[PDB]
Design an enzyme around this catalytic site. Sequence first.
Site, PDB file in Angstrom:
ATOM      1  N   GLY A  66      -1.797  -2.097   6.041  1.00 31.32           N
ATOM      2  CA  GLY A  66      -2.787  -3.121   6.387  1.00 31.32           C
ATOM      3  C   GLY A  66      -3.781  -2.599   7.401  1.00 31.32           C
ATOM      4  N   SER A 114     -11.577  -2.930   2.997  1.00 32.90           N
ATOM      5  CA  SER A 114     -10.265  -2.321   3.077  1.00 32.90           C
ATOM      6  C   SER A 114     -10.128  -1.485   4.346  1.00 32.90           C
ATOM      7  CB  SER A 114     -10.060  -1.392   1.874  1.00 32.90           C
ATOM      8  OG  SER A 114      -8.799  -0.730   1.905  1.00 32.90           O
ATOM      9  N   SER A 115      -8.906  -1.420   4.859  1.00 35.88           N
ATOM     10  CA  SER A 115      -8.546  -0.507   5.947  1.00 35.88           C
ATOM     11  C   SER A 115      -8.167   0.891   5.483  1.00 35.88           C
ATOM     12  CB  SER A 115      -7.390  -1.103   6.748  1.00 35.88           C
ATOM     13  OG  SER A 115      -7.732  -2.346   7.325  1.00 35.88           O
ATOM     14  N   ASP A 122      -7.938 -10.092   0.762  1.00 32.98           N
ATOM     15  CA  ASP A 122      -8.622  -9.225   1.711  1.00 32.98           C
ATOM     16  C   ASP A 122     -10.054  -9.669   1.997  1.00 32.98           C
ATOM     17  OD1 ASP A 122      -6.608  -7.520   2.656  1.00 32.98           O
ATOM     18  OD2 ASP A 122      -7.306  -5.786   1.448  1.00 32.98           O
ATOM     19  N   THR A 151      -3.022   0.252  -3.618  1.00 36.35           N
ATOM     20  CA  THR A 151      -2.402  -0.970  -3.135  1.00 36.35           C
ATOM     21  C   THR A 151      -2.505  -2.147  -4.102  1.00 36.35           C
ATOM     22  OG1 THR A 151      -2.217  -2.371  -1.142  1.00 36.35           O
ATOM     23  CG2 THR A 151      -4.450  -1.795  -1.891  1.00 36.35           C
ATOM     24  N   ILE A 152      -1.477  -3.001  -4.039  1.00 40.37           N
ATOM     25  CA  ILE A 152      -1.525  -4.362  -4.591  1.00 40.37           C
ATOM     26  C   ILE A 152      -1.650  -5.422  -3.511  1.00 40.37           C
ATOM     27  CG2 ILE A 152      -0.430  -3.846  -6.787  1.00 40.37           C
ATOM     28  CD1 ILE A 152       2.190  -4.967  -5.676  1.00 40.37           C
ATOM     29  N   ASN A 153      -1.873  -4.953  -2.281  1.00 36.63           N
ATOM     30  CA  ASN A 153      -2.082  -5.755  -1.057  1.00 36.63           C
ATOM     31  C   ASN A 153      -0.770  -6.168  -0.428  1.00 36.63           C
ATOM     32  OD1 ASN A 153      -3.372  -6.744   1.175  1.00 36.63           O
ATOM     33  ND2 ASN A 153      -3.911  -8.695   0.146  1.00 36.63           N
ATOM     34  N   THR A 165       0.869  -1.199   0.000  1.00 31.54           N
ATOM     35  CA  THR A 165       0.000   0.000   0.000  1.00 31.54           C
ATOM     36  C   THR A 165       0.887   1.224   0.000  1.00 31.54           C
ATOM     37  OG1 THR A 165      -1.539  -1.315   1.273  1.00 31.54           O
ATOM     38  CG2 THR A 165      -1.951   1.077   1.214  1.00 31.54           C
TER      39      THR A 165
HETATM   40  B1  LIG Z   1      -1.187  -2.339   2.194  1.00 30.88           B
HETATM   41  O1  LIG Z   1      -0.023  -3.087   1.723  1.00 30.88           O
HETATM   42  O2  LIG Z   1      -0.799  -1.786   3.500  1.00 30.88           O
HETATM   43  C1  LIG Z   1      -2.443  -3.369   2.300  1.00 30.88           C
HETATM   44  C2  LIG Z   1      -3.825  -2.679   2.439  1.00 30.88           C
HETATM   45  C3  LIG Z   1      -5.038  -3.673   2.393  1.00 30.88           C
HETATM   46  N1  LIG Z   1      -5.020  -4.639   3.497  1.00 30.88           N
HETATM   47  C4  LIG Z   1      -6.350  -2.908   2.430  1.00 30.88           C
HETATM   48  O3  LIG Z   1      -6.873  -2.501   1.365  1.00 30.88           O
HETATM   49  O4  LIG Z   1      -6.772  -2.638   3.577  1.00 30.88           O
HETATM   50 CL   LIG Z   2       3.242   4.900   1.708  1.00 29.03          CL
END
Ligand SMILES: *[B]([O])([O])[C][C][C]([N])C([O])=O
Ligand SMILES: [Cl-]
Lengths: 343, 189
Positions: free
Chosen positions: B94, B71-72, B43, B19-21, B1
Amino acid sequence: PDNHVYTRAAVAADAKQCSKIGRDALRDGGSAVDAAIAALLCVGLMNAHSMGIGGGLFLTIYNSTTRKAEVINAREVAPRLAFATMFNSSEQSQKGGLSVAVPGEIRGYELAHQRHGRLPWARLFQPSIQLARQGFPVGKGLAAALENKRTVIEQQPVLCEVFCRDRKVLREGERLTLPQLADTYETLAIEGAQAFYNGSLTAQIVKDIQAAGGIVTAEDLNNYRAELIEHPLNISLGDAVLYMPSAPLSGPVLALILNILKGYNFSRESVESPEQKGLTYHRIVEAFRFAYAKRTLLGDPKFVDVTEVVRNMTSEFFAAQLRAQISDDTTHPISYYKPEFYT
Amino acid sequence: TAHLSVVAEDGSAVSATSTINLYFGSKVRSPVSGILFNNEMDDFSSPSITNEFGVPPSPANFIQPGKQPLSSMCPTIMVGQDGQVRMVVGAAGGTQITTATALAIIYNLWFGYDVKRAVEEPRLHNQLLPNVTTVERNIDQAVTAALETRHHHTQIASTFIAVVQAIVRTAGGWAAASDSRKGGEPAGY
Ligand SMILES: *[B]([O])([O])[C][C][C]([N])C([O])=O
Ligand SMILES: [Cl-]
Ligand SMILES: *[C@@H]1O[C@H](CO)[C@@H](O)[C@H](O)[C@H]1NC(C)=O
Ligand SMILES: *[C@@H]1O[C@H](CO)[C@@H](O)[C@H](O)[C@H]1NC(C)=O
Ligand SMILES: *[C@@H]1O[C@H](CO)[C@@H](O)[C@H](O)[C@H]1NC(C)=O
Ligand SMILES: *[C@@H]1O[C@H](CO)[C@@H](O)[C@H](O)[C@H]1NC(C)=O
Ligand SMILES: *[C@@H]1O[C@H](CO)[C@@H](O)[C@H](O)[C@H]1NC(C)=O
Ligand SMILES: *[C@@H]1O[C@H](CO)[C@@H](O)[C@H](O)[C@H]1NC(C)=O
Ligand SMILES: [Cl-]
Ligand code: NA
């Protein structure tokens, strides 16, 4: 100390070169959206572990003339062939083609640019195409991610191809080039977003995801849409308004944290002694616990009815009811906060 | 992210989180295009996968075709009553995104820390499940003690908690900060 104050405009990205690219877009007459896209295209190179055109994003956008905020939803969607029971282990959901959701990134850039762009689309890509070809020293963040994932990278030749030197992951300061992405960025610059979703890149995207065990099809790419949200979530704090995205993002969680805490009237005094500071941080953690208890009922609002959940999470009165349950002297067991897995 | 914050000279703003997760996403790179594909499907909840001891999968967040996973992320813009942007903020990391964004806001808005301090100040995290408070390595240890005497069990983050990029309006203009945890720096004019 490391402060940075600007009389006219500013870009805060997670790599200096990408902040500079955003800034240069502004100086050249770009909108905030143009600068954001130019910077994001660069972050997809310098912090390739984090984000890029294979992912998805959300934008919160404020227009100072109209005094209106909007949100652009360009997060990935599950493909048409996906289903609830498609994964049986964490490995299956995390690695390989089946873990891939339909990328939204470029359709998000396109929608944002159509609505708010001033500079030509290709101009947004140009500095990143150069960067990807010339290469750059691997920065702190990418270096640590490379080390963390050294085993998987080193055993996958297609990742090694760009992320290794002498069969080992790149270290901080060593030059990374991204020559295939440079070419892809150039195609996107010239042919537009349609190249990705219904054009010259599409068949190869599908081939790559399917070869790795996935189920994304051309139809999935063709049908992807970014979504404009004209009325984002907001909350009032004092004399301000905070605009943030609702479900499927975590604006409702943030709103509830802040609305719980606002009733404590925190100020500089709240951290001025250890007694005050300790109580303040305890209260913060308890607010987190209450807010995360409510998070388990959230999901995509197109699929799940989150109306009442979100109404509560954004209600100041509901937040006051939760703050009244925060004990100054102790935390509590999980059940105290009433996490719910069903309504 | 990754999180980016932008304010243009006309006062308009963008807060963008992308993000790509997981790190390097799905670990699938195209040899032809160079594209690195997300693993955003991770996710979603899955009925057959337990992620955390004692925690049921969440049915609101099960996979359906055409659905987006929870998503967070929470890219935020704070605007004053006069219509001028006050703060542009968001985070990567995350499930720590939401708490870190809250903290950056609390730190600037209420504690009165300048934007760089609001970004650099030590953070902490609790998400209820699991049932632990994570604190950064350089947090004020009076805070750790205050939490522990109130029966929180704390653990120190192995690395760091989240990555925040922020811009705040000041009398001097637009003050910007990028998080040293990841190594960014802002730019402007
Ligand atoms: B990112 O690499 O911090 C992951 C973000 C993902 N868990 C979301 O969309 O909340
Ligand atoms: Cl960042
Ligand atoms: C998980 O099991 C279900 C039920 O047998 C099946 O439909 C699915 O294909 C499995 N997934 C994987 C990745 O093995
Ligand atoms: C902001 O709104 C004004 C007034 O409607 C409009 O002319 C302008 O195009 C908008 N700016 C952007 C970047 O969309
Ligand atoms: C473009 O879309 C149309 C249907 O909308 C389809 O017939 C065609 O195959 C698509 N081309 C690509 C490259 O996806
Ligand atoms: C906040 O939320 C809703 C949008 O649904 C609306 O009633 C109100 O106008 C919003 N406030 C601001 C300042 O945008
Ligand atoms: C909303 O909050 C009220 C308490 O103020 C509660 O009775 C109600 O069950 C909540 N609604 C949902 C959907 O959780
Ligand atoms: C979680 O931590 C709290 C605080 O010490 C404790 O009271 C509780 O027993 C723990 N376990 C559960 C299941 O909540
Ligand atoms: Cl490449
Ligand atoms: Na700074």
